[PDB]
Amino acid sequence: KEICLDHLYRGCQHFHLPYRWQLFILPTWMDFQDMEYIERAYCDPQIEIIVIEKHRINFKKMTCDSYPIRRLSTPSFVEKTLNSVFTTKWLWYWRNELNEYTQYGHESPSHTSSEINSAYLESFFHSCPRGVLQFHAGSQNYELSFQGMIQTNIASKTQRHVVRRPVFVSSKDVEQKRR
């Protein structure tokens, strides 16, 4: 398990340059060509907008043709492998019609379930916190925006609040989980 930090110190799962410029083409972070030219423009604080071949890069929004961009710093960090009980598992919920929380992938009060689950959403959120994601539940289509922490029915436009919280682990749970 090896990470680099992006331009906002975000952990991202060395390279010949001290920097690596990428854009998110769902589901993969792709290397820009002309990384040194991008960096040189970026290091001029007067520059917001540049063109790199087919691409309009916007440093103020950190987007390129509406896709998120990032700058990885090269200094790598290697995880010290510990018992998995010390790793946080994140659950994802949406506010249902009974004004309660259903976990993604579990049954709504109307006997409907998303195909996406907490593991699917945490993996996408970790990779791409400014992501928007399409998903199915029952007979309906939805967009989830990590930035707004909302899901929207693409047909009706009804929004529901999204919440992300951990699986609870007590100090007792920690002792048991040391075999």
Ligand X SMILES: Nc1ncnc2c1ncn2[C@@H]1O[C@H](COP(=O)(O)OP(=O)(O)OC[C@H]2O[C@@H](O)[C@H](O)[C@@H]2O)[C@@H](O)[C@H]1O
Q: Which does 156 bind (CB under 5 to 8 A by kind): a second copy, ligand X, none?
A: ligand X
Residue (of 179, 141, 146) closest to 163 by Cα position: 146
Q: Which does 113 bind (CB under 5 to 8 A by kind): ligand X, a second copy, none?
A: ligand X
Q: Which does 61 bind (CB under 5 to 8 A by kind): a second copy, ligand X, none?
A: none
Q: Does 158 bind ligand X (CB under 6 A)?
A: yes
> Is the CB of residue 70 less than 8 Å from the CB of residue 5?
no
d(CA 35, CA 31): 8
55 or 106: whose CB is closer to ligand X?
Answer: 106
Pick the binder of ligand X from 73, 117, 127, 140 (CB under 6 A): 140
Q: Does 156 bind ligand X (CB under 6 A)?
A: yes
11 or 138: whose CB is closer to ligand X?
Answer: 138
d(CA 19, CA 17): 5
Token pair of 149 as six digits? 């922490």
Binding site for a second copy (CB under 8 A): 1-3, 5, 8-11, 14, 16-19, 36, 39-40, 42-46, 73-80, 82, 85-88, 91, 93, 100-101, 126, 129, 163, 165-171, 174
d(CA 100, CA 123): 24
d(CA 53, CA 9): 28
Q: Which does 39 bind (CB under 5 to 8 A by kind): ligand X, a second copy, none?
A: a second copy
Which string of b and e fits 81-118 if b means at least 16 CB within 10 Å? Answer: eeeeeeeeeebbbbbbeeeebbebbeebeeeebbebeb
Residues within window 81-120 making contact with ligand X, judged by CB under 6 A: 94, 96-97, 104, 108-110, 112-114
> Is the CB of residue 102 less than 8 Å from the CB of residue 96?
yes
154 or 163: whose CB is closer to a second copy?
Answer: 163
Residue with nearest beta carbon to ligand X: 156
